[PDB]
RNA sequence: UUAGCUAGUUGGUAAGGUAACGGCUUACCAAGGCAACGAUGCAUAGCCGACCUGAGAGGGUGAUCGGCCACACUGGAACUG
RNA sequence: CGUAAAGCGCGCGUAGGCGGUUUUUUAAGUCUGAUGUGAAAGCCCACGGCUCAACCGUGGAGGGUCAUUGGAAACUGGAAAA
RNA sequence: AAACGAUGAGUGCUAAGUGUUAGGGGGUUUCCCGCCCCUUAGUGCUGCAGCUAACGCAUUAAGCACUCCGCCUGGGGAGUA
């Protein structure tokens, strides 16, 4: 949905596998690679793709990445509040942090959060250690994240009476 | 035999969120009316309307939904449940979601939101978070 | 067995008032009659499963209600136990 | 000296089969370090009567007195509730 | 895969004894007491303020330092004070 | 705790755990304030002194499932009434 | 015992349609017994939300919760000593 090449971008690869398809006779393989894409100013998205070679596969993953996009509700260089991500036993848990701390997380989720423009944030992976599921859970957590203005409009009252 | 009415009301509320229906029906109680009033005062409840028939209740509430039909909260649950009752001091009282959410808590002077309970420096037994 | 005739006859003397039909005194009495009946037939037929299951369920319920009347009132327990000659 | 209002512990009686002595069962409920719930565990305080005044099943409170015998210390102060089969 | 333990035991009386209360010890009378909310046994172990670790709840340890307890080749006893 | 280890074959039921609705009441839990106490050293904070640091000192906070006592009664609990 | 639904018991809530077993209320028929709708409880299937490693579960939840009980913490050893 609505891929844009107009903003600045930073490609970032998480993992590459050598993945095989067995047939009679030989043994056919096709490389795979997942990528995350964001402009590190409040917008992010992941990506997947497969091909018989590295550069073509990662290009496919990136061109499919911009098509799925994330608004990344951010505040003060940190997430507005603390949450728990869950997707297919790939659980994950994030929590805001005082400035100067920095993103601490696993490699893939560090890349996800560093590339979404968050500076200081606390988190720890849980459950499964495979990059794909925990990355998708991280993005799912960012999808159901809200900020003060995103809620104050909904409830009849306003900000400055309910605030972080 | 029903072990807990608060569990019933919160399950009814969440199960109303999952299908989105403005009206719901549930046997009322004094604590139930008070917490419904505070729910309306936060802004999550469009309207409140108690009714009377033999004998209790039955409390009818009107839900709230965004213009794009978006559920206001992202989760709702209790803390004080039977067997393991819980309590909370005035300073130790937790800030769930900070301003974002609130923390219903029952006190020696009555049930109020999390804020006023920390302002007055009087704690009590928490009941349910909401956010 | 039991029969509605003898049941309705005996409950009139044990009912707390004319109009009532609950009043576990009534229930304890009819249960006692029932347990004696089933116990006589179970001595007549030694082996079965529905009979002893039933006897156990009704004895449990009778004890539960008898204990209930032990906290609502204190003389009623006594007058029933020494009138039915039960709960030694 | 007069500085203690002695530790007054209500409880009930369990037996009366010894001279001038009873076995008060004090009751309280205490927490758990790991969890935060409550559970009640009983005790059996033996007690010094004057003429076996207390009954079986009675409700009474007691007080610290002094070591009076082999593992019996408290004396009665006031019988609270006395009754027959309930 | 430690379920019954306890007969001075538990209670009383009397006396003695102890700085003191106390089956603490004697003689008499009574049969109680302890135990699933874990007695008793077995096995190990001095305890604590703390130390290490952990975000936190927790987990492990009881080296220095301080407090308390127990012991001085092994067992028994008592004088002095 | 379907299939991966993990619901006993099931039943009757003690002790226990949990508890429908409303009112009054108690204030045990709970909340709240004070009092005494939680030795000192130690951990943390702040400062000072050994050339600095290590270290040490000072003072503070912190530390109870703590006791006494002044208040509250929504909730748990006790009593009484629907 | 593969005693199984490889699904502990009790309670409450959450789209549907289609049947089957023993009932009930109402309208349509001169008479419903002929027809329909509605309500029960079990007894099935297809399926949405949601949930799951996936398969599948879906008011007869493996969903949304509460109380209580049982149990597991790698395989072989071994149900063995």
Curated annotation (Swiss-Prot), chain A:
Any one Gene Ontology BP term: translation
Keyword Lipid biosynthesis: no
Keywords, sorted A to Z: Ribonucleoprotein, Ribosomal protein, RNA-binding, rRNA-binding
Domain S5 DRBM: 9-72
SUPFAM superfamilies: dsRNA-binding domain-like, Ribosomal protein S5 domain 2-like
Pfam families: Ribosomal_S5, Ribosomal_S5_C
Signal peptide range in chain numbering: none
Presence of the UniProt keyword Cytoplasm in the record: no
One Gene Ontology term of the molecular function aspect: structural constituent of ribosome
One GO cellular component term noted in the UniProt record for this chain: cytosolic small ribosomal subunit
Function: With S4 and S12 plays an important role in translational accuracy. Located at the back of the 30S subunit body where it stabilizes the conformation of the head with respect to the body.
Family classification: Belongs to the universal ribosomal protein uS5 family.
Domain notes: The N-terminal domain interacts with the head of the 30S subunit; the C-terminal domain interacts with the body and contacts protein S4. The interaction surface between S4 and S5 is involved in control of translational fidelity.
Subunit structure: Part of the 30S ribosomal subunit. Contacts proteins S4 and S8.
Full protein name: Small ribosomal subunit protein uS5
Source organism: Staphylococcus aureus (strain NCTC 8325 / PS 47)
Recorded name of the encoding gene: rpsE
Curated annotation (Swiss-Prot), chain B:
Keyword Membrane: no
Xref: SUPFAM superfamilies: Ribosomal protein S8 (SSF56047)
InterPro entries named in the record: Ribosomal_uS8, Ribosomal_uS8_CS, Ribosomal_uS8_sf
One biological process term in Gene Ontology: translation
Cross-referenced Gene3D superfamilies: 3.30.1370.30, 3.30.1490.10
TM regions (residue ranges): none
GO terms for cellular component: cytosolic small ribosomal subunit
A Pfam family per the record: Ribosomal_S8
Protein's name in the database: Small ribosomal subunit protein uS8
Native organism: Staphylococcus aureus (strain NCTC 8325 / PS 47)
Swiss-Prot record, chain C:
Alphabetical list of PROSITE patterns matching this protein: RIBOSOMAL_S15 (PS00362)
Keyword tRNA-binding: no
Protein's GO biological process: translation
One Gene Ontology molecular-function label: rRNA binding
Keywords: Ribonucleoprotein, Ribosomal protein, RNA-binding, rRNA-binding
HAMAP family from the UniProt entry: Ribosomal_uS15_B
Protein known as: Small ribosomal subunit protein uS15
Swiss-Prot record, chain D:
A Pfam family annotated for this UniProt entry: Ribosomal_S17
Keywords: Ribonucleoprotein, Ribosomal protein, RNA-binding, rRNA-binding
GO cellular component: cytosolic small ribosomal subunit
Record PROSITE patterns: RIBOSOMAL_S17
GO BP, sorted A to Z: translation
GO molecular function: rRNA binding; structural constituent of ribosome
Stored CDD domains: Ribosomal_uS17 (cd00364)
Keyword Ribosomal protein appears in the UniProt entry: yes
Recorded superkingdom: Bacteria
Annotated InterPro entries: NA-bd_OB-fold, Ribosomal_uS17, Ribosomal_uS17_bact/chlr, Ribosomal_uS17_CS
PANTHER family: 40S RIBOSOMAL PROTEIN S11 FAMILY MEMBER, SMALL RIBOSOMAL SUBUNIT PROTEIN US17M
Function: One of the primary rRNA binding proteins, it binds specifically to the 5'-end of 16S ribosomal RNA.
Family of the protein in this entry: Belongs to the universal ribosomal protein uS17 family.
HAMAP family, per the entry: Ribosomal_uS17_B (MF_01345_B)
Complex and partners: Part of the 30S ribosomal subunit.
Name this protein carries in UniProt: Small ribosomal subunit protein uS17
Organism annotation: Staphylococcus aureus (strain NCTC 8325 / PS 47)
Higher taxonomy: Bacteria, Bacillati, Bacillota, Bacilli, Bacillales
